[PDB]
Amino acid sequence: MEALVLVGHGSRLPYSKELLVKLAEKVKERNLFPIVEIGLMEFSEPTIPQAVKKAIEQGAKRIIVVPVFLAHGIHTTRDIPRLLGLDENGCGTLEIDGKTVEIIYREPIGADDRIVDIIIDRAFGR
Template sequence: MKNYSVKKTHMKAIILFGHGARDSRWREPFDRLASLWQQQQSGTPVQLAFLEMMQPSLAEAVANLSAQSATQITVVPVFFGQGGHLRNDFPVLLDACKAQFPNIVLSATPAVGEDSSVLQAIVDFGVRAL
C-alpha cells in the first residue's frame, strides 16, 4: 500500500494596517498603496484595515482574507513609528484575531517607518523637492 500524503497549500496574504481618521480622504494614499500591491504582487491578496474611525477593522480584514482561503497573514503597520497605538492597542487586537481565527497564522512586521529603506525613500523624496 502506498501512503499518499495530502499537501496542504499555504496561501499567504497581507494586511496594510493604518490608524484611521474622520476625514475619508485620509485613506486615499492607503487605497493607492493597496492598489500598487495588487498590481505588483497579484498572487498575494491584500486588505486594508484600520485601528479606529474607518473600516474594515483588523478582525474584519482577517475574516475577509480567511474567506479567500488565506492561511498565513502578515500585518504591516503603516505607521511612522512605534507609538502607544502600536505598543499597546495593536498587540491586543492581534491577539484577539489569533484567538478568533486559530487556523490562520498571523504575524506582524515593525512599523514601516522604522525600516531604513522607507526612511531613505523619504530622504530621496526631500532631495527631489529641492
C-alpha cells in the same frame, strides 16, 4: 496560501484611507501576494478584524500584518497586538470555520534610508 494585511491609523479626515488603499493597489500590482487587504485603526472601516476576516474568507492560512506607521506608538505596541489576539509565549493563533490560521505581526517602517530619499525629494519640491 498567504495574505498581506496592511494596517493604518484612523483620522476622521479621509486622507489616510486613500493612502492605505493606494498602497494596497501598488503592492497588488507587484503580484507577489494573492490576497491583499487593508485595515484602519480607528473611526473608519474596515476595522482590521474585518481585514483578517476577509483575508481568511478568500482562503488564507498565514496573515502577514504590516503596520503602515512611520514610528512605533501606542497603536503599534499595544492596540494592534490586542485587536489581533497576539500575546506572550506564542506569536499568533486564530481558529475560525474549522481552520487554524496563524498571524505574524511585522514592524513599522522606521528610519529607513528610503524615507530619507523621499524626504529629500520633498525638500526639493519633488
